Amino acid sequence: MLGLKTSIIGRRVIYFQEITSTNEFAKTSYLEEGTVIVADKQTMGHGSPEGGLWLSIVLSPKVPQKDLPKIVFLGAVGVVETLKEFSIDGRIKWPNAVLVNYKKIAGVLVEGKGDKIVLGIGLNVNNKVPNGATSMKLELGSEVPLLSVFRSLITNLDRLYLNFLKNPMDILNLVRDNMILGVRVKILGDGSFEGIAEDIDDFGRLIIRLDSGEVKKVIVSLRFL
Amino acid sequence: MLGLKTSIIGRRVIYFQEITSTNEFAKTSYLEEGTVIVADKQTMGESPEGGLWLSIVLSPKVPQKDLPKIVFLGAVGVVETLKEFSIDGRIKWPNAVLVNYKKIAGVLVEGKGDKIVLGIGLNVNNKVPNGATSMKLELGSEVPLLSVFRSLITNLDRLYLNFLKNPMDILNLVRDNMILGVRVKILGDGSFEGIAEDIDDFGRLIIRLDSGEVKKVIYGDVSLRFL
């Protein structure tokens, strides 16, 4: 009854009033490629109250092993395109987040269970959000039809994915033109360091120029300074 | 993303752009009670795009003598939804809803032990066969398919929960919304004609033959035709 017109993503949709995790369900259940798992709320979300868009998409891209790490970008760019349709300007915080005026509005989590890949996306729409974060509702000043957002996002993801299967390098430039670059960041963890986020390379790695001139490639906890 | 607020029916919903049969998928698959299977179209129902094609997995803990009444939950739910859209649906015993004697919806219940599958087919915006009708044809314009879905699921959940408590309650609702007082022909072994008087405490159709004989029809290996 949803009348989705997508080719792969959205061929089937499994909706839950409540679920522990859409990613976990997608990983442990046999599902046809393109199956979308969506829930009103997730009890055990990871990286999800009522009002947000919480979903996972089952993919099985028969593409080279090296571009597998690009699936996360499909999710982020998909979100950016959807936000634009709703008059919101989202920017990608490498490698899995979308911010609006530096406030997080969405997050992406990709897991490769077995031979299938699960693309998880969490987008704040009408749900309450933690201080520092934002939502489509807070940006627009009014409640946004959640199903309208779902339809828009699924449509964009199906298009991006079909093209990815043919021209897998295309997504990188879309990410570049929509990500936060030219600013100082810090990579947390052992061997921590700071520098300018210059660009992403052909593998999707973040290229950091340290003040010494050294160039590092990040394949991760990132912080804007 | 659908934000359903039902107790059992609609806890989960599996949507298909296309499927062979929602009833067959529901019967075959391992699904929890209340799961709704819905598709834009059924290739082996064909049930064309524009209609509402769904099946619901149920596991009612009530005596078997009541199981035959599940088809009525479907029929009444459809009637209630139609009334919400100001369409006068009337029940054709025991598994169809007509509007001006033209079929607008059909109900098919299939059960295997514990799991019962309630299938419902409702013509909304789809083209229909001769003699049939649709919500679109009745209202004169297209109807938001999702709105009909939300309406029906809400009605079915309420009806089902009450059925678990009071399995006889549904019979009163069927009586108030069914076509009665008219002549009908019952097709089976030895077909016969008479006036459809009412449905009894088991949901059996009560027919008064011209001779005065009263026959009680059990759904199963019989069909009903209006004269």
Domain co-membership, A9 together with A92: yes
Residue A29: CB atoms within 10 A of its CB come to 12
Which residue of chain A comes nearest to B14, CA vs CA?
A14
Give the contacts of A124 (CB within 8 A, at least 6 positions apart). A52, A104, A105, A106, A133, A134, A135, A136
Residues on chain B bordering chain A, Cβ-to-Cβ distance under 8 angstroms? 1-4, 6, 10-17, 38-40, 49, 52-54, 145-146, 148-149
**Cα gap A162→A6, rounded to integer Å:** 10
In this complex, do B1 and A150 lie within 8 Å of one another by their Cβ atoms?
Answer: yes
Q: Say yes or no: B151 and B184 in one domain.
A: no
Q: Which amino acid appears at position A80 of this protein? A: V
CB of A211 closer than 8 Å to CB of A224: no
H or E element, residue A26: helix A22-28
Instruction: From residue A18, give the alpha-carbon distance in Å to each of A41, A45, A160, B2.
Output: 5, 11, 28, 11
> What tokens does B154 get?
């809400």
Query: Rg of chain B over CA atoms, in angstroms?
Result: 17
User: CA B45, CA B107: separation in Å to the nearest integer?
Assistant: 12
Secondary structure class of A104 (helix, strand, coil):
strand
Closest CA to A203 of A61, A73, A47: A73
A133–chain B nearest CA distance, Å? 21
Q: Find, among A22, A200, A21, the residue nearest to A95 by Cα.
A: A200
A76 lies in the same domain as A122: yes
Q: In angstroms, rounded to a whole number, what is the distance separating the alpha carbons of residues B147 and A121?
A: 27
Same domain, A145 and A54: yes
> H helices of chain B, where?
22-28, 70-84, 135-139, 145-165, 169-177
Resolution (A): 1.6
Q: How far apart are CA A38 and CA A9, in angstroms?
A: 13
CATH number (domain holding residue A189): 2.30.30.100
A202 and A161 within one domain:
no
Examine the domain organization and report whether B211 and B174 are in the same domain. no
What tokens does B149 get? 């879905």
User: What number of CA atoms fall less than 13 Å from residue A29's CA on the CB side?
Assistant: 19
Which of B10, B12, B149 is facing A1, going by the closest CB pair? Answer: B149
Nearest to A18, CA basis, from A47, A58, A48: A48
CB contact under 8 A, B15 and A3: no
Phi, psi of B151 (to 5 degrees): -60, -50
Owning domain of residue A76:
1-180
Query: Do A140 and A44 have their domain in common?
Result: yes
Among the partner-chain residues A3, A14, A147, the one whose CB lies closest to the CB of B12 is A14
What are the φ and ψ backbone dihedral angles of A126, each rounded to 5 degrees? -115, -5
| B3·A55 Cβ contact <8 A | no
Spell out a b/e string for A70-87, using b for 16 or more CB atoms within 10 Å of the CB, else e. Answer: bbbbbbbbbbbbbbeeee
Is residue B91 domain-shared with residue B164, that is, in the same domain? Answer: yes
φ, ψ (nearest 5 deg) of residue A21: -160, 125
Output the CA torsion A30→A34→A40→A44 (10° steps).
50
Identity of residue A151: R
Q: Are residues B187 and B174 in the same domain?
A: no
Instruction: Tell me the CATH number at A67.
Output: 3.30.930.10
Of B160, B179, B198, the residue at which a domain comes to its end is B179
Q: Which of B15, B20, B29, B41 to mutate to test the interface with A (most CBs of A within 10 A)?
A: B15
How is residue B79 written in tokens?
């009637």
What are the φ and ψ backbone dihedral angles of A171, each rounded to 5 degrees? -60, -30
Residues A134 and A199 in one domain: no
Q: Do B14 and A15 touch (CB under 8 A)?
A: yes
CB count within 10 Å of CB A68 equals: 16
Distance of alpha carbon A26 from alpha carbon B218, whole angstroms: 44
Q: Write phi, then psi, for B212 (nearest 5 degrees).
A: 100, -20
Neighbours of B125 (CB within 10 A): 20
Strand partners, A207: A199, A217
Do B17 and A12 make contact, defined as CB atoms within 8 angstroms?
A: yes
Experimental method: X-ray
Phi, psi of A158 (to 5 degrees): -60, -45
Instruction: Tell me: do A100 and A208 sit in the same domain.
Output: no
Domain count, chain A: 2
Cα gap A205→A219, rounded to integer Å:
5
Q: Do A2 and B52 touch (CB under 8 A)?
A: no
Nearest to B1 among A1, A6, A15 (CB): A15
CA separation for the pair A9, A27 (Å, rounded): 16
Pairing, β A193-200 against β B183-187: unpaired
Whether the Cβ atoms of residue B132 and residue B123 lie closer than 8 Å to each other: yes
Distance CA A11, CA A158 (A): 10
Partnered with residue B206 across adjacent β-strands are B198, B216
Mark yes or no for CB contact B13/A10 under 8 Å.
no
**Do B110 and B196 share a structural domain?**
no
In chain A, which residues are last before a break of more than 2.5 Å from C to the next N? Answer: 47, 219
DSSP characters over chain A: ------SSTTSEEEEESSBS-HHHHHHHS---TT-EEEES-BTT-----TTSEEEEEEE---S-GGGGGGHHHHHHHHHHHHHHHTT---EEETTTEEEETTEEEEEEEEE--TTSEEEEEEE-SSS---TT---HHHHHTS---HHHHHHHHHHHHHHHHHHHTT-TTHHHHHHHTTB--SEEEEE-STT-EEEEEEEE-TT-PEEEE-TTS-EEEE---EEE-
C-alpha distances (whole Å) from B90 to each of A76, B105, B157 are 51, 10, 20
Tokens of B41: 């179209």
> Left, alpha or beta for B63 (phi > 0: left; psi -120 to 50: alpha)?
beta
